[PDB]
Design a protein around this ligand. Structure first.
Ligand SMILES: CC(=O)N[C@@H]1[C@@H](O)[C@@H](O)[C@@H](CO)O[C@@H]1CP(=O)(O)OP(=O)(O)OC[C@@H]1O[C@@H](n2ccc(=O)[nH]c2=O)[C@H](O)[C@@H]1O
Length: 360
């Protein structure tokens, strides 16, 4: 048949949620009809299919104490307005702040709201939002949730929670079993904020053999608030890491690169650890909060280090990089996880969930 799907997100900037949304949208787009409603005006970082109808809420002023409070009622009713005027068969919204907003704004309309947590339940640190999520989330119609520990957490107070994986858009593009002629390149891809923890990457490149360190290229794709101080500490330790910062063509690095390191303290299902599956990139990652083992059979299809162990990382790095027959084995076992992220399969459960929610 057919449905109007409306996606509601804050921004469409170089993120992980926005990466999933567009993969789905681009895929549902062809059979169905897919509006996106995004708050912060601007363009999308990710090539968005042409049929995807995209509508941005207004720009609002947050100067003056008046406009500081007023622009929330104006935003809210501007949101309720767009939702009404989408006449969508279903609303799917993304991330806690946007999710709680949508639940309130949707109070009234007779259309289903899906909402999805896209990060471990413990990330939401403050006390008010952790509370508003507890009161408002049982009023949605379903709930997408990535890690199992989050389903066990959200099932306590939400009646319909589903575990949907993320869909890797590379799954259709990159043929399974492709020759990759790699280059001495280690990749760090991600936001340069405190949790993503890029400093541990630097500290660890410091501790590598001069042999390796002088023949390998190290690269930090991504930008954050740490992009300045990271460059300072790169001098303080004195290594050669090439900050590129928000590079829309990560496919180009993902090929040449041999290894990819993730250093974050807590995550849900990082797509950087999913995309590598498609490029014979070997993953090395901190045993981050909770969902670590769901993604990496340590020493079988990846390598896990203690959280924030600058040395542990370097050893594992030096381990793979002094050993091509190993790196090459790990990834051939990692190719095995590729299916668990094909958009084709992931899309149809989104479609399945939309159907049951559209009944009642
Ligand atoms: C701390 C945290 O809770 N992170 C969550 C994560 O656990 C997942 O749940 C994920 C999916 O919902 O969302 C967040 C990931 P987060 O926002 O941190 O991003 P991620 O690591 O999962 O992936 C983001 C990345 O952006 C891209 N990129 C990077 C650099 C660049 O120059 N250009 C790019 O396009 C990548 O291709 C990529 O997929």
């Amino acid at each position: 048949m057919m449905m109007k799907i409306s996606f509601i997100i804050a921004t469409l900037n170089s993120g992980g949620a926005e990466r999933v949304l567009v993969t789905l949208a681009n895929a549902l787009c062809k059979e169905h009809e897919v509006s996106i409603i995004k708050f912060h005006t601007g363009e999308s970082f990710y090539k968005l299919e042409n049929e995807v109808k995209v509508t941005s809420l207004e720009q609002f002023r947050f100067d003056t104490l008046y406009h500081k409070i007023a622009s929330r009622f104006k935003k809210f009713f501007a949101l309720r307005k767009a939702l009404k005027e989408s006449k969508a068969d279903v609303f799917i919204s993304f991330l806690d702040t946007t999710n709680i907003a949508c639940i309130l704004a949707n109070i009234g309309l007779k259309t289903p709201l899906i909402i999805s947590e896209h990060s471990n339940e413990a990330y939401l640190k403050p006390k008010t939002w952790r509370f508003l999520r507890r009161v408002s989330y049982p009023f949605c119609d379903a709930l997408s949730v990535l890690g199992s520990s989050d389903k066990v957490y959200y099932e306590r107070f939400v009646k319909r929670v589903k575990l949907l994986l993320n869909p890797c858009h590379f799954s259709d593009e990159i043929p399974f079993d492709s020759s990759f002629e790699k280059e001495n390149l280690v990749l760090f891809i991600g936001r340069l904020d405190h949790n993503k923890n890029p400093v541990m990457f630097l500290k660890a490149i410091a501790h590598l053999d001069k042999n390796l360190q002088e023949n390998y290229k190290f690269v930090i794709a991504g930008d954050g608030e740490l992009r300045q101080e990271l460059e300072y500490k790169v001098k303080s330790l004195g290594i050669k890491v090439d900050f590129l910062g928000r590079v829309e063509n990560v496919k180009a690095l993902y090929e040449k690169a041999k290894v990819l390191c993730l250093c974050s303290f807590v995550e849900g299902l990082p797509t950087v650890l999913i995309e590598s599956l498609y490029f014979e990139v070997c993953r090395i990652s901190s045993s981050y909060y909770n969902g670590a083992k769901d993604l990496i059979k340590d020493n079988h299809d990846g390598l896990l280090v203690g959280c924030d162990d600058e040395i542990a990382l370097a050893k594992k790095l030096e381990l793979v990089l002094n050993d091509e027959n190993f790196r090459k084995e790990l990834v051939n076992n990692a190719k095995q996880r590729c299916k668990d992220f094909e958009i084709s399969n992931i899309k149809e459960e989104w479609l399945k969930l939309i159907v049951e929610v559209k009944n009642a």
